[PDB]
Structure 1
Amino acid sequence: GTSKLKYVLQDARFFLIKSNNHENVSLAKAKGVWSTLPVNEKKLNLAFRSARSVILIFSVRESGKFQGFARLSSESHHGGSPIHWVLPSAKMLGGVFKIDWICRRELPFTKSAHLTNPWNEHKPVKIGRDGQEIELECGTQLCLLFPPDESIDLYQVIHKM
């Protein structure tokens, strides 16, 4: 069902993550981690303190799709296991966020054409820079459009809230 998902998304904040390649999203899906440039790191750390859930919605550039979404489980930290990102240069990144995936399935942009983001001039939600915040209602409806991921159990994520 969709009820535990709606509970996790209640009063959440949402951010668009744009990856240059599929390899980095595959690493994030396998290891449960993301890293971003310091300007976005600071925004995500502020958001993590401010909201019950902070949701990252991932899209690989030129793919025409979103590849899934995940919830921050920590602020960023330094000095863990090093991550061999494909950088498009590793010293330029900030710390590492731990994330819990909520959906690892794809959603094509053609299915989100009716959703506009007020925080980006009401452009279609697919449009945005890496780190663009997505307003609550747009972000909630976007996450509810993804196919259900029946491999994930949100019981443990609810306990982290």
Structure 2
Amino acid sequence: GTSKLKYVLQDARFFLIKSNNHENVSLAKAKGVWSTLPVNEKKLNLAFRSARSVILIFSVRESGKFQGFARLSSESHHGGSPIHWVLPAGMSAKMLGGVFKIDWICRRELPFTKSAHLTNPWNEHKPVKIGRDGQEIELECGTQLCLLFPPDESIDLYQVIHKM
């Protein structure tokens, strides 16, 4: 069902995460971590303190899809074992140095064709697929987008509700 999912998304904040490659999203799914550039790291840290749930919705550049969504379980922290991210050109490792812990809510894909009816007020009412890495998605649009994903029956949200 969708009741626990709706509970987790209640009064949540939502952020679009753009990845330049699939390898980093795969690593995030396996290890439950994400790192972003310092401008977005600061925004996510502020949001984590401000809201019951902060949701990252992932899209690999040029894939035409979202690859799933996850909830922050921590602010960013430094000094773990360096995550072996695949850096795009110009991207350095100190740039991606802060590591957030995340709990996946859905690891299934959603094609952009299925979200064409959803527009984001915080990005000029452009289709929600459109946005830079870190773009915030308004509550109603973000909730409806998350509800469009296929259900992920491998995930039990009971432990996530307890983190809240």
CA drift of 1:94 comes to 3.7
Aligned length: 161
| 8 A contact 1:35–1:95 mirrored in 2 | yes
Matched-pair identity in %? 100
Q: TM-score, normalised by structure 2?
A: 0.97
Q: TM-score, normalised by structure 1?
A: 0.99
Alpha carbon RMSD of aligned pairs, Å? 0.5
1:59-109 alpha-carbon deviations (Å, 9 max, x no partner): 000000000000000000000111010000101224100000000000000
Q: Paired residue for 1:128?
A: 131
| 8 A contact 1:48–1:74 mirrored in 2 | yes
Unaligned runs of 5+ in 2: none
| 8 A contact 1:41–1:94 mirrored in 2 | no
| 8 A contact 1:18–1:59 mirrored in 2 | yes
Q: Paired residue for 2:73?
A: 73
After TM superposition, what 4+ stretches of structure 1 lie above 2 angstroms from structure 2? Answer: none
- Whole-angstrom distance in 2 between the partners of 1:83 and 1:77: 12
- Whole-angstrom distance in 2 between the partners of 1:56 and 1:8: 13
CA drift of 1:18 comes to 0.2
Q: Paired residue for 1:143?
A: 146
Unaligned runs of 5+ in 1: none
